[PDB]
Amino acid sequence: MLGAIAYTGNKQSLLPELKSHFPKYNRFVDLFCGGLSVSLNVNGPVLANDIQEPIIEMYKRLINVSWDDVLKVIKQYKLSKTSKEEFLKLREDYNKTRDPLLLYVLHFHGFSNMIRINDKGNFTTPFGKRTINKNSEKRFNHFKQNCDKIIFSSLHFKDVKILDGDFVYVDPPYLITVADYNKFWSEDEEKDLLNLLDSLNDRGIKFGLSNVLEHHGKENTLLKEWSKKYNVKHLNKKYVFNIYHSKEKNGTDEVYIFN
DNA sequence: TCACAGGATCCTGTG
DNA sequence: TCACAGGATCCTGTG
Ligand SMILES: Nc1ncnc2c1ncn2[C@@H]1O[C@H](CSCC[C@H](N)C(=O)O)[C@@H](O)[C@H]1O
Ligand SMILES: [Ca+2]
Ligand SMILES: [Cl-]
Ligand SMILES: [Cl-]
Ligand SMILES: [Cl-]
Fold this sequence. Notes:
The protein is α/β, with parallel strands linked by helices. Helices cover 36% and strands 14% of the residues. The structure holds a DNA duplex.
């Protein structure tokens, strides 16, 4: 199921399997919502949270615009698969005006669609030799058809209030894989998230957590130990096949850990 | 005789 | 991107 935008680490292809394991709830809390692959596709009320304010503000803005507003901008900046100089201009405009619609248009044209915003709040992703495509308006339409049930927020995961009846879904930056958002992460942040999860458990609140125990030769030892206190679902089909067929090393063990 | 240039080391951020 | 210039500190040497 579609996410609002292309996004490193999105859960589009895994969502059906994940919904399999979800519990019932009064409110769905997507604590690290990212590209919104989870939030757009679960029953509301939904609280979509992400520490990257510019992206959250961009979603809040999308609610009131039409695909036509997007094309007008793309037209006025004469962007294309090869408009490197035009892309730099849009980038500067987004950086001094901070209008979220521009951030939305920029993301379609940058390096691997990455949205990188530095400390000063500027977008520094280089040109990606690309522009809108078949899925652009699709993800866009899917966002419009399902954003009603969402309340957006941009707080650090531990500063979000968790209410009884909340089903907390947690898909954070993973230490052992590669993403720009990994700059907001560390062994300490992870200890904090796992303690938070344990508390939710102490309070009888259901949670679900996405991660990887092994990737390319690296393993997350503390996460493996911690996962033994809960249910564990292995999701990478290839990883599971190879496990039964006993024949390979350095695979990606994608898991879903839950109480 | 304390101001300051430049070094060293670590780490951050960009193309 | 994943190299790698150059911040950020703290420190050492210089007149
Ligand atoms: N401390 C923190 N609190 C909340 N969100 C955080 C965070 N640190 C990083 N993030 C956010 O963690 C997200 C991990 S990626 C999650 C992707 C999402 N499930 C999808 O389908 O697109 C990123 O979007 C990042 O901005
Ligand atoms: Ca370079
Ligand atoms: Cl003097
Ligand atoms: Cl490059
Ligand atoms: Cl002197």
